Design a protein around this ligand. Structure first.
Ligand code: HEM
Ligand SMILES: OC[C@H]1O[C@H](O[C@H]2[C@H](O)[C@@H](O)[C@H](OCCCCCC3CCCCC3)O[C@@H]2CO)[C@H](O)[C@@H](O)[C@@H]1O
Ligand SMILES: OC[C@H]1O[C@](O)(CO)[C@@H](O)[C@@H]1O
Ligand SMILES: CC1=CC[C@@H]2C[C@H]1C2(C)C
Length: 465
């Protein structure tokens, strides 16, 4: 008959004095102990409903999709995106951009490469680079970002960038820094007190600046595309958008605007790059800490694929152990622990509570990924979490790192293909080493907010043979 129960708030501060210094997620997990799976937290001036566990999350996103499919704000990036692009759009804008993005992220036209082939080619470029790396120590972040960025680039720009391109690397650095700043303790505080903190210097201003710098490239690329556009033969996603723009130009309210073009494109690149690369970063740190897992994956690669033939998506069904390892990397790395904020679009009943229209909702994906009923000892890295007694792949409904329902990650298929192909192609060709003994490796995230970000680390890729 009212909102879900929760800690008693104070005017101005909301529930600040009841929060945990370790961050938002820890805070909400402490509230879950007391209130259960459905509760309200006042983040500064705003009530936010938290939903925990796969049952509550699925009930909201799947069974009640007519109410829970709205997109909420991330305070650190809202001043930039301002509801433009598919991630941060609502209503008809979202309908149009989602439909457009889904179609263009999968259909490239006659005589164009499949997603699979794009990844396989990028994987071969990566192996070549790693061979030329001379077994040197590196932080692999730049390469994990390059390979994933290049998949999106091939779709959006119709090209890839070279690993040596300093201007490409500058953009990748901006994505990396931005994701870290957003996920920082300041970024989390801003979620509570943006109304006040927006008047002062801080990370929010650096985030704005970083994003506009990336956007500057996108805008210029759009103009280059427009100058060379052949309506009979669109080259890429940008061309296809420009054609819709032309078609709808007599409509002043067309969603196919330049602001949607720039910011949808930026949205796709940001999500397409930072998600998969961060997962890869964690994945290889985990392989350094658990070398027996990496050794067992390599044995499976040897037995199924061999040393020379490039891995392909068809190999997945015959590689239950490798698939389990990747599932477990995703489960353990818990990329977006609180997902991306939703908003309720209409007055709704949920488990006896009344949630008014326009009430922000966080689906705490982390609580599903760490559910001890689905994953025994969920705090530990263990590929057996995704294997049955016979060593066959055991998929589970608790595995929801891409979320669920209408807003489900539109890049899920691309991401899974990237994870499998890049992971297997690297391990086929290289073993890993570092100066830190497995027992000494610390998996504690460098940042844990909107994103869970692994610590920096050094690694060697040693050619096999
Ligand atoms: C390991 C990799 C990835 C993970 C864990 C992940 C996870 C997520 C999550 C949790 C959401 C929020 C869904 C919600 O609102 O409930 C999301 C949304 C989104 N993702 Fe991903 N994602 C990944 C890779 C990608 C890739 C490679 C792309 C680009 C092709 C992408 C594009 C998007 C877009 C455009 C949205 C916004 C969807 C919408 O609001 O309609 N993601 N993703
Ligand atoms: O349009 C005006 C602006 O242009 C010049 O900046 C350039 C630099 O000339 C130029 O070197 C540069 O090259 C970037 C190529 C790499 C693109 C990487 C993409 C990866 C995926 C997401 C989009 C970016 O891109 C920037 C934006 O075009 C300038 O740096 C800024 O003065 C100026 O604000
Ligand atoms: O819609 C597909 C989604 O549904 C699930 O299978 C539920 O477990 C998720 O793993 C997947 O992301
Ligand atoms: C979908 C997303 C993945 C990571 C961060 C939040 C969005 C982003 C702002 C691109």
């Amino acid at each position: 008959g009212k909102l879900p129960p929760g800690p008693r708030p104070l005017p101005l501060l909301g529930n600040l004095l009841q929060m945990d210094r370790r961050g938002l997620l820890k805070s909400f997990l402490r509230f879950r102990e007391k209130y259960g799976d459905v509760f309200t937290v006042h983040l500064g001036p705003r009530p936010v409903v938290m939903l925990c566990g796969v049952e509550a999350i699925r009930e909201a996103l799947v069974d009640k999709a007519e109410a829970f499919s709205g997109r909420g704000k991330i305070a650190m990036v809202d001043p930039f995106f301002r509801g433009y692009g598919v991630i941060f759009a609502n209503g008809n804008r979202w309908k149009v951009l989602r439909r457009f993005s889904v179609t263009t992220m999968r259909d490239f036209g006659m005589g164009k490469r499949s997603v699979e082939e794009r990844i396989q080619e990028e994987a071969q470029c990566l192996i070549e680079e790693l061979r030329k790396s001379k077994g040197a120590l590196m932080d692999p972040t730049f390469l994990f970002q390059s390979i994933t960025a290049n998949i999106i680039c091939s779709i959006v720009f119709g090209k890839r960038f070279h690993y040596q391109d300093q201007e490409f690397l500058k953009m990748l650095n901006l994505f990396y820094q931005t994701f870290s700043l957003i996920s920082s303790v300041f970024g989390q505080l801003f979620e509570l007190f943006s109304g006040f903190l927006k008047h002062f210097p801080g990370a929010h201003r650096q985030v704005y600046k970083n994003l506009q710098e990336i956007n500057a490239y996108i805008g210029h690329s759009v103009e280059k595309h427009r100058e060379t556009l052949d309506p009979s033969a669109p080259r890429d996603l940008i061309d296809t958008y420009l054609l819709h723009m032309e078609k709808e130009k007599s409509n002043a309210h067309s969603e196919f605007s330049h602001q949607n073009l720039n910011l949808n494109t930026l949205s796709l690149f940001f999500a397409g790059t930072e998600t998969t690369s961060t997962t890869l970063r964690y994945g290889f740190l985990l392989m350094l800490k658990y070398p027996h897992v990496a050794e067992r994956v390599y044995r499976e690669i040897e037995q199924v694929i061999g040393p020379h033939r490039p891995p392909e998506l068809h190999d997945r069904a015959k590689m239950p152990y490798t698939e389990a390892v990747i599932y477990e990397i995703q489960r353990f790395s818990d990329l977006l622990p609180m997902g991306v904020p939703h908003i309720v679009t209409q007055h709704t009943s949920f488990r006896g509570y009344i949630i008014p229209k326009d009430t922000e909702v966080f689906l705490i994906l982390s609580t599903a990924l760490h559910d001890p009923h689905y994953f025994e000892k969920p705090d530990a890295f263990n590929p057996d979490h995704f294997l049955d007694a016979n060593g066959a792949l055991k998929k589970t409904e608790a595995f929801i790192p891409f979320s669920l329902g209408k807003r489900i990650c539109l890049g899920e298929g691309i991401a899974r293909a990237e994870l499998f192909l890049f992971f297997t192609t690297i391990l086929q060709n290289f073993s890993m080493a570092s100066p830190v003994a497995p027992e000494d490796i610390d998996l504690t995230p460098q940042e844990c907010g909107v994103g869970k970000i692994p610590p920096t680390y050094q690694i060697r890729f040693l050619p096999r043979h």
